Symmetry: C2
Subunit: 413 residues, 2 copies
Amino acid sequence: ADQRIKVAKPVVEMDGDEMTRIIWQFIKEKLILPHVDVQLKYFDLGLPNRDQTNDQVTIDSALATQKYSVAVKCATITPDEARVEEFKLKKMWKSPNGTIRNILGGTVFREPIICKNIPRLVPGWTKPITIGRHAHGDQYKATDFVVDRAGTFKIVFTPKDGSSAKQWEVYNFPAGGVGMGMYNTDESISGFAHSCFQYAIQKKWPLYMSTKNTILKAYDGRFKDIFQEIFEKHYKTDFDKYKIWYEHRLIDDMVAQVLKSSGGFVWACKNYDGDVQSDILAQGFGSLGLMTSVLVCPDGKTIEAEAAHGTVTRHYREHQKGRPTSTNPIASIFAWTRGLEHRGKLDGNQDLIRFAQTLEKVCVETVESGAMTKDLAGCIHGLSNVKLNEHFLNTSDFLDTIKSNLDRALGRQ
Amino acid sequence: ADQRIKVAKPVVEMDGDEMTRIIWQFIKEKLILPHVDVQLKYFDLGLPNRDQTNDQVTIDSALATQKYSVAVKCATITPDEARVEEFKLKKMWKSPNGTIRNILGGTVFREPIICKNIPRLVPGWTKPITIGRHAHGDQYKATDFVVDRAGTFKIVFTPKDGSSAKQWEVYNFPAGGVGMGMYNTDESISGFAHSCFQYAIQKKWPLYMSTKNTILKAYDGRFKDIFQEIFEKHYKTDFDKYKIWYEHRLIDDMVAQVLKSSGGFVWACKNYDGDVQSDILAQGFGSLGLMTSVLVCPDGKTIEAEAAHGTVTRHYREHQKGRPTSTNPIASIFAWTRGLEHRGKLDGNQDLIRFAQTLEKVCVETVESGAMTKDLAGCIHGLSNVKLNEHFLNTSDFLDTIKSNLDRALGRQ
Ligand SMILES: [Mn+2]
Ligand SMILES: [Mn+2]
């Protein structure tokens, strides 16, 4: 090789679990470190270390991200009963993503990584679609509980200024059941709106925001009102100028509209809807492994790029048996590239920016050239008609191919 | 002569709004009344009458349904700010569907009405999919509010038996925002589970139930636990016997799995998810107008069949100008057939059951023969390449074709 790109500021690195943790290291050693001299503020968010630090490492990584402005995160495990037993956890630690997002705040933008040779499950989507998932509140910062006997469920709001408090009787349970309370803030919703309007303008695409305000008149109505107010005051002039538009839509009408569309728009989703619908989008364009996920804070300075899929336990078990696997690392690679690209933009480091964009292009070109992992090969020839080294490559070999293609792309620059 | 089929018990009829209200009457006059002598317990749920009765007519229709066991419902308008002004409403009346479902309870089963010549937007779904939407609680019976200043949001649960009350601080608002509380009951969830397991066995199909219990551990965990408990105690023996299975899945994993599947399964959805995902299914199979929606109550005797799509305001405006339209009446027709079929099953009226099933088959055969409304014609030739009487027919003419085909079919019997 030659000189490695010098990076003036550090990048926060959040290590993850199982198979994703394994390929994360492969990516670091084969594609990043050899070409980039970056200081990494390492935080092991692997389940074992979270348990050892009583989940404090998760909070620490979020604070570090605020300080340094950029973080790249590896997929992690959100503990359930079985995981508690498997890892002998002292507590069923809450979702680290939820914790990080709550601290940083913002919008998680998700878009498909388009490869011309990968078949879409929804033929009609000829253009990409971007989802802006509000990353704060609602079901992810809720208080839920089980009721085991008849009783009254009420809510009390007590003003800090000392003004008259208010109460609501949510329900008088005749017997057992469940209850929950959730919230969101005008401040968080506003930041969410601004980020989405700005993204739509950058893309020169229309923007749609979905809710079910016909049912949750106050809660969802707030989202609708704030979006419209912010639109009229700050973005309508530009939207009209660029011949795009902004429209609120009821969630059920919206999902049908999207499925029947040809894509080419930004879709602002509440936290829960963003979670559910982004997986429909990823799968619809071809694969869950072909999607980027970047948390953009309202400050327009801080971001957290992540691999938003599972930890591929199946493959991990094989890896533990000393066997190679064919795990798609593309999503993890884009977490690194989006992070390095932002680091470069903040520092005005053109070489780093060019490196990140080059690696992303090389990933797509590599797949389009026919080199890919088993999952993608299956999407083309059928999950039951693909043979190793014939239709797909194992993770390590796939990465070596990317590395080769990368050097070539950089050499011709 | 009067050869109408005699019906011994009444059927509750819930009239609706705008264009659906118009075609509802066409259906009654052209397809139902000429062939069936049924006593209809009429309730006008049109927005104007709901306003006139302070929405009491909605409750009255639900009580009638409990009494007579069968209701057929026309699509209605759920009032928003614009509707309040348009209809000069004294109040923004809540969703009548939510009101009826809360009173009756149960599961809303939704399935596509498959026509061989209508293209799917999701090619992979070679077999139908049925969604069992829990019809009670959650967001549809929630208490939501806007917070306009700093203050504490807390929840208090006070047991009736005098045992220790419980309190939770949901959030301390630093400024303005929104808050809400929602609930569900063990009883309602259990009825929902039973209906879905029974439906899967009737279909000889696997059953999947989705939640996000990794986040809402108590609330969603309750659904997961109750389903598993009921499965093991009442249905595992039959599922094993018929080689089918029951599995819980996280909602985001589930939607991706569904999109990539070939269909052929029952999907139990929480109220909200059922609402959103049923529109994706309807659109995915071809059209929002090609879907049945039947509320099956916990008592295993009461049902409410409805046309679950919009009121087609656009076409209604044209109708008001004395102009004919090409509005798809199939969903509304199936509301009547599913209702009459159940009436027949309860009364042991074979002729009525045969009539209902014959009419459903005739509708499908008619569309497959090439006779259809503009929306379906567009799905085949393209919304911008269809000509009246060439590729599609206006509503009245389409209904006349169905009537003609129906008589021919009933005659062969
Ligand atoms: Mn997700
Ligand atoms: Mn709906």
